[PDB]
Design a protein around this ligand. Structure first.
Ligand SMILES: CC(=O)OC[C@H](/N=C/c1c(COP(=O)(O)O)cnc(C)c1O)C(=O)O
Length: 382
């Protein structure tokens, strides 16, 4: 028997740890889940179902239900694209577009582009964690409270708009080297913004955000460590690759992406590698010395990409190389990607060139629009 999962979403404020993901992998790999006699005695199982994108849960004595019965494959989007509110537009206007690129890579590596700038608040992937984190937060923390974090740019914009749609106040902390949209947009959206000229990278701002949180009593929502960030991308960004691949007819053989906190490619890789362990996750290591806005090297510290059981390859990519790839996707497809998207296109194009990749369809996850990166556009043309 099928019942609604919304009612049983207190498991989000009770299950801790990652042991529950063992349930996810088996349900996904099998393509079904066992009926629960007592839904409340199985917090791990219920959470796993929500995390893979179920809308319903299987209840009763001995039965099972398929992923489609559970609602992993439910179409959310109104054909007409009419939404009664922006927050509902983020929620139901999904998947973000998967576009097959005219870009040709060697060895029959076919490039598809998942365009995460089709998010309403930050025109970047960072929307998805920001709605998930703040949505759970609405359960516990009183309205009018200040919520805050460090950001390269995208999450601080996403946090600011979503915080304010949920009644909460927003503070974002940025390194001096971040883009102007990050420093400016939150203020347009009613947040306070603090910029540390000396902080060379976003992770380096963390101690400052923790100290001030201890002094001031604001809630530091902490995207690096906050498990909602990984869970958003499990039921959203990852799940969508799963569903679109099947419905699109794709011979999916891999994903390509970039790493900041590691939330989205950790979720894509894990979800996809549950369904089929061969699927590669080609990830980008920004080259040493260089700065690619939004992303970083793994060994500067990432939660999920380390601790979860994920097969992944790295490819080194310089900024100049990421910008070359912006330019060529823009000439091939006329779509203008952000620096971090070009870093993942490039990194896939290398493994493809190397001969390390099987023939078939790869989905690259493009985190934002190049329209927010005029300086790095200008510099890459000259
Ligand atoms: C460096 C860092 O931790 O940034 C996290 C977060 N950025 C995510 C991000 C990423 C990486 O996504 P995640 O690994 O954080 O899921 C890639 N590209 C762009 C343009 C991004 O904005 C932010 O905006 O604060």
């Amino acid at each position: 028997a099928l019942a609604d999962i919304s009612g049983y979403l207190d498991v989000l404020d009770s299950v801790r740890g990652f042991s529950y993901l063992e349930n996810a992998r088996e349900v996904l790999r099998s393509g079904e889940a066992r009926c629960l006699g007592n839904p409340r005695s199985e917090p791990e199982y219920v959470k796993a179902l929500y995390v893979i994108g179920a809308s319903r849960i299987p209840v009763g004595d001995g039965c099972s239900h398929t992923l489609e019965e559970l609602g992993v494959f439910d179409i959310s989007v109104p054909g007409e694209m009419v939404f009664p509110s922006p927050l509902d537009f983020f929620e139901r206007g999904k998947p973000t577009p998967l576009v097959r690129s005219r870009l040709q890579l060697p060895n029959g590596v076919r490039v598809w582009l998942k365009l995460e700038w089709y998010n309403p608040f930050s025109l970047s992937v960072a929307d998805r964690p920001a709605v998930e984190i703040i949505s759970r937060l609405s359960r516990r923390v009183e309205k009018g409270s200040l919520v805050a974090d460090a950001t390269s740019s995208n999450f601080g914009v996403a946090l600011s708009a979503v915080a304010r749609l949920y009644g909460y106040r927003a503070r974002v902390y940025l390194p001096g080297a971040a883009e102007e949209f990050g420093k400016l947009l939150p203020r347009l959206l009613g947040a306070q913004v603090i910029v540390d000229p000396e902080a060379p990278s976003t992770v380096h701002l963390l101690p400052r955000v923790m100290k001030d949180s201890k002094n001031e009593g604001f809630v530091h929502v902490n995207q690096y460590y906050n498990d909602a960030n990984f869970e958003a991308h499990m039921r959203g960004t990852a799940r969508e690759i799963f569903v679109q691949s099947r419905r699109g007819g794709l011979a999916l053989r891999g994903v390509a992406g970039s790493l900041g906190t590691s939330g989205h490619m950790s979720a894509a890789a894990f979800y996809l590698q549950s369904v089929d362990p061969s699927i590669r996750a080609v990830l980008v290591q920004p080259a040493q010395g260089d700065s690619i806005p939004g992303i970083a090297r793994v060994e500067t510290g990432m939660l999920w990409i380390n601790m979860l059981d994920i097969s992944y390859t790295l490819a080194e990519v310089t900024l100049e190389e990421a910008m070359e790839a912006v330019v060529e996707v823009a000439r091939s497809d006329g779509l203008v990607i952000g620096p971090s998207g070009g870093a993942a296109v490039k990194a896939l194009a290398k493994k493809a060139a190397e001969g390390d990749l099987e023939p078939g369809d790869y989905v690259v996850v493009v985190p934002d629009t190049g329209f927010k990166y005029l300086s790095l556009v200008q510099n890459a043309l000259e």
